[model samples]
Target: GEWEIIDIGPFTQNLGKFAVDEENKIGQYGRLTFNKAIRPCMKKTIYENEGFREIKGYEYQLYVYASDKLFRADISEDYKTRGRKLLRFNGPVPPP
Candidate 1:
């Protein structure tokens, strides 16, 4: 698999790759290191948040796996927000 930068935002950045273990029946998963950096200008926005605020210099892994059953837990949390299907085995992926 290839290493890639997923996003670059005013407050966050992500680096990772999405891959599958086809032989093991693990349909989809990924390993990512998130960069939730804080700029001086973002202080006001950070103070206004109530949810889990990411820390500067913090890094973590995210794994998403799914099977044919459509079980809720097997789906990635970002399936809706990210606006894309996470796994497909039927055919080759179309280009973006």
Candidate 2:
């Protein structure tokens, strides 16, 4: 009965069924999974792009980045949400 992230399927199956984008990325899925496990997530989510271009495999970078921030032993919830970033530590690199 705890929180959980959903599985990936044909993103194409969602096309036209909602106002969705044509592109699909694993990173997108990775993040929402985080939101799923964490609280205060919504059925409608927000995604951002860096304009001009982005790394091809940027999905796992977040998982890797958050994993670095995952040293709280998972008993407490602060660090996991810290990995989520509410106006802090997002993009470019991990916390300095």
Candidate with top TM-score is: 1
Deviation (Å) of 52 in candidate 2:
31
Worst 10 residues of 1 by lDDT: 38-47
On residues 1-96, what C-alpha lDDT tens digit does candidate 2 reach at each position? Answer: 123332323331221111111111324423311211122122222223446332222111111123223201011112224222121123323232
* Candidate 1 lDDT by residue in tens digits, 1-96: 112232324322221122123213452333222223212111111112245543222122222222311111111223124422223332221212
Local error of candidate 1 at 65, Å?
A: 17
RMSD of each: 14.3, 16.6
State candidate 2's TM-score.
0.15
Q: Which regions of candidate 1 fall more than 4 Å away from where they truly are?
A: 1-18, 26-91
User: Clash number for model 2?
Assistant: 0
Worst 10 residues of 2 by lDDT: 15-24
TM-score of 1: 0.18
